[PDB]
Amino acid sequence: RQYRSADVQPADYPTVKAVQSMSDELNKETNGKISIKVFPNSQLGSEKDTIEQVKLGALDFIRINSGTLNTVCPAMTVPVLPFLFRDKAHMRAVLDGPIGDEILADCASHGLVGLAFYDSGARSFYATTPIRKLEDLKGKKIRVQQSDIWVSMMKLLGANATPMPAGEVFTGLKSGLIDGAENNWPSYDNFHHYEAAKNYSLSEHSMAPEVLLISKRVFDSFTPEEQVQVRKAAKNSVGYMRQLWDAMEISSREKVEKAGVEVITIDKAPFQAAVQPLYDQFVTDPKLKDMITRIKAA
Ligand SMILES: O=C(O)[C@H]1O[C@@H](O)[C@H](O)[C@@H](O)[C@H]1O
Ligand SMILES: [Cl-]
Ligand SMILES: [Cl-]
């Protein structure tokens, strides 16, 4: 059985290679019984639409950002929150441990089994003009993921959110529909956004990680041994992914700088102050508020 998985990222991207590595492991351990074919580059649809396919059992696996998954699974809002993690090492420790496992377990009741977190760096603003301070964002049309938290966030920052699928963003930057967007270094590179919006400002305002999930309907068809094998292959793929990822952050930043991008250092304090209301607005469950307390102290 060759199961199917979706990713908006290109064929050679670390998230795609990670799931392919998981497939290789499963193919070996199950002696051909289970493998996974990845369909990259939004071939199967947007993140919004592919998450619905998984809920319906129309799609077996999905690799999506938590910043869209949190439309369905409330716990996924927690790791999206701006300025929550101190740095990459803090995030990795949290997501690899009990807190990460607790968040992944939240998805099952919604028809999706959470299997692993993949790194996504920190998301930063980029635009067709240089954003040198928060005030420079005022009135700008900034694309966000199709998830309400980001609309609220842009409002607090004085910008105008335009939610749209990942595959439409380059076109919007070239057409004038949007003035900018926000993402990590490998995405700024690999979606070609740097060609159209040549000013990248290190706001580092979210570390929203990626999530790999399986349809609950499909998972439930697996033997108990197969379920253990799938979870273990998913966890093993995190370390594989991270090695590819850390190199790509370097090579992508180098590539776009060579192409003429201005990399802008920006005072984050006004951003942090502006977005604080999001925490109580979007995280209302006492269990999740306690989780945030534990994360802040980890
Ligand atoms: O902004 C987006 O649409 C994209 O951002 C990337 O960082 C993430 O890897 C994609 O899964 C998608 O969420
Ligand atoms: Cl300012
Ligand atoms: Cl999308």
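^ chloride ion complex. The chain has one domain: 1-298. The longest helix spans residues 224-258.
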